[model samples]
Target: AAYWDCDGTEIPERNVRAAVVLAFNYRKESFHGYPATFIIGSTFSGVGEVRQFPVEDSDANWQGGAVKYYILTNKRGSYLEVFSSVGSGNKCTFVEG
Candidate 1:
């Protein structure tokens, strides 16, 4: 398992949460063709509580279409689950899993 370290007290929840909010509340793209997901690892880390707060542990380089996001608590024990849906027109809603 790999871990990231960050300096100072700059938090990254805003960006990560923003991604989910955007993906759930609004997806700024057509669900045309096929939907895909890509989990990219981040180069930053901190010793914070992960009771429910998912970690932003991404892989190396990534190149593909828009990917729905998720947060992992313990990289080694946690799992990065991803899925996609295909439909027409522009829609936004949280589809229960």
Candidate 2:
């Protein structure tokens, strides 16, 4: 894959992670229509960990419908997975940062 900087400069991939964190925003007629949650699982330093975060359909980003973001850390191939636990919608835009 090809990686580019904000200025459109080509960059080499070095020590990159298997996943990406995307800043997203949702637009729909009803609020919290797609209340989606994300489960983050990772393993590092020979230890395993799991965490949960509300990604979509929360009051945190409801006002003004501002863009919300989440981070998927670089687990370095130690059982890293992220998934949504609720309904999925197409009225969302995952902005590239």
Candidate 3:
């Protein structure tokens, strides 16, 4: 899992938050007409029940993109992050794994 380093001065202290498991598949079942390259982030003051962020596009373009998991406050207060395994395929879970 990747680790997020927030500016020590930006906030008073560091906080690691949890996001509910919200899995989405791309390819044949892509979301919003976009490949699974798109990922949503949960945060404070963030609306629409979900927030989306685009995974960095892989130059290989072999149907894989960098998937990053993030942690943020619902009031847009604090945020942290982690990186996922490379090369996307099959169904995988990491929130608890």
Backbone clashes (count) for model 2: 0
Per-candidate TM equals 0.22, 0.19, 0.19
> Whose TM-score is higher: candidate 1's or candidate 3's?
1
Q: Which stretches of candidate 2 lie over 4 Å from their true place?
A: 1-47, 52-75, 87-97
Question: What TM-score would candidate 2 get against the native?
Answer: 0.19
Best by TM-score: 1
Give all candidate RMSDs, comma-separated: 16.6, 12.3, 12.6
lDDT of 3: 0.28
Q: Poorest 10 consecutive residues of model 2 by lDDT?
A: 14-23
Q: Whole-model Cα lDDT per candidate?
A: 0.28, 0.28, 0.28
Q: How do the residues 1-97 of candidate 2 rate in per-residue lDDT, one tens digit apiece?
A: 4332312222222212211221123322233342222333424333433222123223232223432322233223243233332245212232234
> Candidate 1 residues 1-97, lDDT tens each?
2222222122243443433333323222223321222233432234221211222325321123443333323233233222122344212222232
**For model 2, what is the error of residue 35's alpha carbon versus the real structure, in angstroms, after optimal superposition?**
18
Q: Considering only N, C-alpha and C atoms within 3 Å, which residue pairs clash in candidate 3?
A: 41-51, 43-74, 44-73, 44-74, 44-75, 44-76, 45-74, 45-75
User: Count of backbone clashes for each model?
Assistant: 4, 0, 8
